[PDB]
Amino acid sequence: SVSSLQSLCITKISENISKWQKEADESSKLVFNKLRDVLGGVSTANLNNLAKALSKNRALNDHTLQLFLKTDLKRLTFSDCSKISFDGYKTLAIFSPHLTELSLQMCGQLNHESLLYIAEKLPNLKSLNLDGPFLINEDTWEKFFVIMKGRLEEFHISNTHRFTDKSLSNLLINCGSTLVSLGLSRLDSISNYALLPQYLVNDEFHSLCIEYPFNEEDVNDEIIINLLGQIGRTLRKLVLNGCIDLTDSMIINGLTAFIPEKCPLEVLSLEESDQITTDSLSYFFSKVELNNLIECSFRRCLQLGDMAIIELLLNGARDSLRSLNLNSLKELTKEAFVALACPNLTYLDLGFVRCVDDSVIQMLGEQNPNLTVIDVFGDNLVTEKATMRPGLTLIGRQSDSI
Amino acid sequence: SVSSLQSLCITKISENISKWQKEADESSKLVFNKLRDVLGGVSTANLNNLAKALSKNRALNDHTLQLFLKTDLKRLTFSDCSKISFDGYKTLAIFSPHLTELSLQMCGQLNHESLLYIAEKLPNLKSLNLDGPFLINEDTWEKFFVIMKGRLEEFHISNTHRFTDKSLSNLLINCGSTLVSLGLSRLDSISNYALLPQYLVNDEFHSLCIEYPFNEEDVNDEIIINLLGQIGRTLRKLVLNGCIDLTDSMIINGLTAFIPEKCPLEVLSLEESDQITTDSLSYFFSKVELNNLIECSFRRCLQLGDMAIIELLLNGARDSLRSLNLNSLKELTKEAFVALACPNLTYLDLGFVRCVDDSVIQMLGEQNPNLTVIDVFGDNLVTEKATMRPGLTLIGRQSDSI
Amino acid sequence: DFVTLVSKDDKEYEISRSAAMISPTLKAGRIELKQFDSHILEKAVEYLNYNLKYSIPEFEIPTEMSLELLLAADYLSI
Amino acid sequence: DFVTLVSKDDKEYEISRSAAMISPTLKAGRIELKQFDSHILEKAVEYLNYNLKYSIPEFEIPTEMSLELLLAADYLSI
Ligand code: NA
Numbered sequence: 001s002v003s004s005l006q007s008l009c010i011t012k013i014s015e016n017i018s019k020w021q022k023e024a025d026e027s028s029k030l031v032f033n034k035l036r037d038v039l040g041g042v043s044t045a046n047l048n049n050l051a052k053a054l055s056k057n058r059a060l061n062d063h064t065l066q067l068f069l070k071t072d073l074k075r076l077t078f079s080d081c082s083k084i085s086f087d088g089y090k091t092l093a094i095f096s097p098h099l100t101e102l103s104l105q106m107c108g109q110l111n112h113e114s115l116l117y118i119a120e121k122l123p124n125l126k127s128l129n130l131d132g133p134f135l136i137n138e139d140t141w142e143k144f145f146v147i148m149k150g151r152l153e154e155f156h157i158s159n160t161h162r163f164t165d166k167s168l169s170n171l172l173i174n175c176g177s178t179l180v181s182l183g184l185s186r187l188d189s190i191s192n193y194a195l196l197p198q199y200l201v202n203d204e205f206h207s208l209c210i211e212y213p214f215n216e217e218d219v220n221d222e223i224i225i226n227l228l229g230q231i232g233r234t235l236r237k238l239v240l241n242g243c244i245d246l247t248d249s250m251i252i253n254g255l256t257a258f259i260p261e262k263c264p265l266e267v268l269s270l271e272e273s274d275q276i277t278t279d280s281l282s283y284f285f286s287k288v289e290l291n292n293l294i295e296c297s298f299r300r301c302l303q304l305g306d307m308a309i310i311e312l313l314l315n316g317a318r319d320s321l322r323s324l325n326l327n328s329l330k331e332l333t334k335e336a337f338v339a340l341a342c343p344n345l346t347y348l349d350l351g352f353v354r355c356v357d358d359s360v361i362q363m364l365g366e367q368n369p370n371l372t373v374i375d376v377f378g379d380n381l382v383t384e385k386a387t388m389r390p391g392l393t394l395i396g397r398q399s400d401s402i
Numbered sequence: 403s404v405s406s407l408q409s410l411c412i413t414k415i416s417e418n419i420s421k422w423q424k425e426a427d428e429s430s431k432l433v434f435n436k437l438r439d440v441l442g443g444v445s446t447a448n449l450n451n452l453a454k455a456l457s458k459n460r461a462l463n464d465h466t467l468q469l470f471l472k473t474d475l476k477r478l479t480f481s482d483c484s485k486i487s488f489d490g491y492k493t494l495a496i497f498s499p500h501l502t503e504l505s506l507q508m509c510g511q512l513n514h515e516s517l518l519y520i521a522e523k524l525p526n527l528k529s530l531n532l533d534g535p536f537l538i539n540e541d542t543w544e545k546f547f548v549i550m551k552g553r554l555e556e557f558h559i560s561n562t563h564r565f566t567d568k569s570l571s572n573l574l575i576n577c578g579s580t581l582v583s584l585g586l587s588r589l590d591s592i593s594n595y596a597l598l599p600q601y602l603v604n605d606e607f608h609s610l611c612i613e614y615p616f617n618e619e620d621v622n623d624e625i626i627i628n629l630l631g632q633i634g635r636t637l638r639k640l641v642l643n644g645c646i647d648l649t650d651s652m653i654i655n656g657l658t659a660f661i662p663e664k665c666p667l668e669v670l671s672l673e674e675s676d677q678i679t680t681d682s683l684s685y686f687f688s689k690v691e692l693n694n695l696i697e698c699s700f701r702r703c704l705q706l707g708d709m710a711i712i713e714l715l716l717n718g719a720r721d722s723l724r725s726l727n728l729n730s731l732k733e734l735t736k737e738a739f740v741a742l743a744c745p746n747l748t749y750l751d752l753g754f755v756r757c758v759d760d761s762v763i764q765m766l767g768e769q770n771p772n773l774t775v776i777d778v779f780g781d782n783l784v785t786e787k788a789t790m791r792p793g794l795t796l797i798g799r800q801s802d803s804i
Numbered sequence: 805d806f807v808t809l810v811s812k813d814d815k816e817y818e819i820s821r822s823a824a825m826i827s828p829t830l831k832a833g834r835i836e837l838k839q840f841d842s843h844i845l846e847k848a849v850e851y852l853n854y855n856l857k858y859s860i861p862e863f864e865i866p867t868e869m870s871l872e873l874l875l876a877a878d879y880l881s882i
Numbered sequence: 883d884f885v886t887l888v889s890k891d892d893k894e895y896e897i898s899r900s901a902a903m904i905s906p907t908l909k910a911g912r913i914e915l916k917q918f919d920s921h922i923l924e925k926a927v928e929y930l931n932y933n934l935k936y937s938i939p940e941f942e943i944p945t946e947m948s949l950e951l952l953l954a955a956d957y958l959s960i
């Protein structure tokens with residue numbers, strides 16, 4: 001009925017280890033600052049830039065990961081985690097408690113234990129982007145979403161056929177009303193896209209991404225219209241790539257119906273929609289004002305011609321666009337680029353744009369002061385004589401094909 | 403042909419992380435000393451005593467494990483590791499590089515990665531004792547022995563049916579000539595005990611332990627005789643428990659033939675050998691001098707009578723024994739205990755020794771100044787009137803059976 | 805009706821025989837407990853009396869002696 | 883036949899047009915490289931010349947500027 005003296009000493013010891021943990025955690029902070037300071041120091045504002053440099057050089061691994069530990073950083077992006085082990089992910093979670101947004105791209109080694117460490121050790125986590133977590137099975141996804149119930153506001157997952165319809169249901173059941181941003185890209189086992197309008201009810205929803213459904217008819221006009229009837233009001237990012245089953249119906253009965261004239265869209269992508277016509281998009285763009293559009297892509301929207309692009313530029317987007325992708329728009333003529341005069345445009349993808357020639361590149365270089373890169377891959381009518389005033393570089397020349 | 407400036411900076415960074423690791427390793431040393439000092443401090447000489455206290459209280463786990471990290475300790479024993487995770491074992495290996503001898507008892511969670519961390523991160527490791535590593539399969543055992551080739555001088559494994567004959571062969575092939583101490587206890591899949599005389603050729607071999615073979619005929623007289631012909635000269639510890647197939651032949655043709663008269667044995671155990679006679683052991687003990695015998699057990703050697711014990715005591719063991727186990731020796735009489743007068747004896751197991759009565763306990767208490775514990779479980783003729791001079795305690799009374 | 809107890813230092817301590825009976829390793833008489841300081845034994849005796857009394861307030865254990873006191877409780881099996 | 887280069891500080895640096903051609907992001911002319919100190923650009927130019935020459939001794943990189951220099955090499959794609 002009385003605890004032994006041994007047990008009592010053990011309780012005292014255990015209690016003091018816990019308090020000593022926090023002291024040791026601080027001593028860890030200083031040791032990690034020492035590493036960063038010895039290399040010349042690095043503010044938190046540049047940590048993501050450092051991660052990008054390492055990622056591009058396949059140099060992000062458990063060793064270099066230590067550069068990012070015990071900081072007050074809140075939003076971290078790793079562009080290539082391929083070499084980070086399951087223990088690397090666990091250590092990051094232990095030593096980065098201030099994280100609210102985390103993006104792990106090419107995270108092939110992230111496993112069950114790694115995923116639950118992230119959910120349970122990052123109490124402020126509200127946004128998770130994962131590309132390639134192919135180890136996680138459907139039952140683990142369920143456990144992760146239960147743990148994140150009511151906390152997860154942003155979830156993007158890509159490149160895994162083990163994220164099943166069951167896993168999508170558990171995401172929506174556990175986090176549906178909390179989601180304001182959702183991404184589903186290259187998920188071969190997903191077919192129940194029709195459930196999205198039921199569960200995505202948050203009145204602040206702003207980012208929807210759907211790319212390359214396995215069976216294209218599973219992302220049809222009816223589903224996207226119903227979804228737009230829910231989120232169109234606050235939508236700032238709409239990405240629908242490879243959804244080849246969509247038609248002008250989505251444009252006429254969905255976008256035009258439910259996107260406000262004071263359109264807050266900052267990102268719009270409708271790649272590979274060979275059934276959308278120039279007419280429907282012209283009709284839609286003339287109705288709304290796109291004064292906040294930063295990024296726009298129509299890659300492989302084979303039907304789109306001049307008026308779609310002209311209506312886009314003349315209805316606000318001209319002054320805000322920073323990157324524009326017209327790749328494979330064979331129907332465009334020189335008249336479309338006459339109107340392409342944007343003060344802030346920096347990147348322009350004109351790959352496989354038949355009409356582009358030296359005169360177009362010349363005109364674009366003079367009408368776009370901040371344009372720095374133009375992809376002309378496939379534009380055979382662009383020769384060496386293509387004038388390139390100081391600062392502009394052309395990629396996709398013949399030298400890149402021999 | 404010229405490395406990019408990015409790659410060169412990455413090499414410089416990576417190189418300085420490695421050098422900073424050692425600095426961080428030292429800062430870790432101070433933080434672990436702080437924990438120990440805050441609790442009153444603990445020298446390395448008491449670390450094993452601390453581990454024992456925690457083990458007996460089921461209080462050894464990943465949390466309390468931190469008390470034992472970053473020390474200069476060389477020999478560590480954990481009596482109950484059940485609650486230590488695979489990460490606990492990995493952290494111990496990382497933060498205890500000075501280890502040469504490690505005993506992990508009840509190490510159920512030790513897995514493939516944990517075992518290879520031990521072999522690869524403890525460069526001075528030469529002795530490993532594992533009890534209950536039931537996760538390790540035969541193929542992992544092989545990899546561990548390849549890594550320990552030429553380094554492993556002492557190996558004891560117990561309580562796992564996944565340590566197969568193949569695993570034993572890989573132990574002997576890779577470490578045979580290096581072994582001076584070997585333990586095989588309760589290994590249900592082991593049958594090739596006949597290979598031991600071939601491989602255990604080290605001229606300094608001193609400790610052999612074999613307990614409870616699955617098929618008792620696999621440990622026969624012929625094998626033990628041949629083995630004694632190899633190691634008998636330097637043998638300091640011989641333990642053969644549950645090897646019920648052994649007979650006086652092992653005693654006459656093995657022990658007596660190959661144990662030197664100046665016998666260095668410090669530990670001798672022959673439990674459950676119901677075929678060994680009083681005559682053979684008397685014959686053997688009168689030939690040799692056992693001036694160094696510290697521990698001796700004849701538990702459940704049902705045939706053994708007075709002369710075996712008398713010859714043992716009168717041929718040197720009387721002055722050196724510290725613990726003696728006569729449990730279930732029903733053939734003993736009071737005359738055996740007349741000679742049991744040992745200056746250093748502290749523990750005596752007389753459980754189920756028919757002849758023991760109050761007069762024997764009385765006599766033993768007066769003839770053994772350092773005797774502190776006597777187990778009389780089953781000795782019904784021991785009553786409450788059993789005199790217990792100051793310092794002696796009797797365990798196994800009737801109060802422990804009702 | 806007491807039992808004496810000696811520390812590493814020459815300081816002694818007396819304990820009720822009924823209190824020292826809690827320790828299976830204290831059958832005395834007189835016992836010499838080398839390797840343990842005076843402050844440790846004083847706390848061990850404090851626990852023994854504390855044990856017999858309530859065998860409920862908490863038994864305070866100073867942080868600066870938690871490790872050494874654990875070892876003493878183990879040896880005493882208390 | 884040179885190309886001027888400006889640092890965050892008003893200090894300037896000239897580079898052989900053939901040397902600056904190694905950087906896909908330097909098509910100039912004149913370039914203003916804010917956010918980078920004078921010691922960093924001086925080392926970037928040192929690498930560019932070092933590159934054109936042997937394109938072999940090792941290019942020394944001071945430890946105290948390894949991180950910031952990595953970021954500059956990334957932006958310059960060198
Ligand atoms: Na680590």
Ligand code: NA
Binds near residue numbers: 493
């Ligand atoms: Na840990």
